[PDB]
């Protein structure tokens, strides 16, 4: 019935937007990591450390949205 026709679109959007968000966020965040590394190599272990520390907090909402999108696209639909 009509449910099959809207959910596969709603999830589509709900996850494409999170894609845009996480992609641009991580691109920007990693750009400064690379410039810092090229500026002062051998600090790379420390930059990588605190980069991954921060990056973990960037994925939160995008990944929540991905999870709920899938929870809809299959378990609801």
């Amino acid at each position: 019935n009509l449910n099959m026709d809207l959910l596969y679109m709603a999830a589509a959007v709900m996850m494409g937007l999170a894609a845009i968000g996480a992609a641009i966020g991580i691109g920007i965040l990693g750009g400064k990591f690379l410039e810092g590394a090229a500026r002062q190599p051998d600090l790379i272990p420390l930059l990588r450390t605190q980069f991954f520390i921060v990056m973990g907090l960037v994925d939160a909402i995008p990944m929540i949205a991905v999870g709920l999108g899938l929870y809809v696209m299959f378990a609801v639909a």
């Binding site: 500026r39 002062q40 190599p41 051998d42």
Partner: protein, 57 residues
């Protein structure tokens, strides 16, 4: 340091001629001070002019 630049003053090239900045006294009665220096300079300038490179003072 952790970065480096291609500035001319920092890396060698083919010696085609040399410059000398010569410091001398303005007054006499100093003994051999000036002449030892000028003789050393003349010796090395002769070395360089043997290799066919001019020099400027």
């Amino acid at each position: 340091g952790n970065l480096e630049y291609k500035h001319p003053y920092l890396e060698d090239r083919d010696v085609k001629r040399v410059g000398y900045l010569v410091v001398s006294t303005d007054r006499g009665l100093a003994g051999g001070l000036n002449i030892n220096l000028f003789k050393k300079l003349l010796a090395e300038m002769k070395t360089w002019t043997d290799k066919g490179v001019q020099a400027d003072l």
